[PDB]
Amino acid sequence: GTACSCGNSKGIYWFYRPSCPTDRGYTGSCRYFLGTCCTPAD
Numbered sequence: 001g002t003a004c005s006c007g008n009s010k011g012i013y014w015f016y017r018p019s020c021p022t023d024r025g026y027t028g029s030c031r032y033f034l035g036t037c038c039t040p041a042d
Contacts, residue, residue: 004037006030011039 002013008029013032020026020038028037 001002003041004032006037006039010041011037011038012041013037 001015004013006009007030013019013022013035014037015035017036017038018031020024020029020036024042026038026042027040029036031037
């Protein structure tokens with residue numbers, strides 16, 4: 001995955017993934033150009 005930002009933080013860029021995984025511990029996510037950015041960056 002690539003490194004993305006939701007404004008003032010870093011997150012993980014998921015290719016075509018509007019729904020973050022449950023196995024991880026993400027709180028918020030910002031829609032990306034192609035995919036989405038799940039934060040925090042784990």
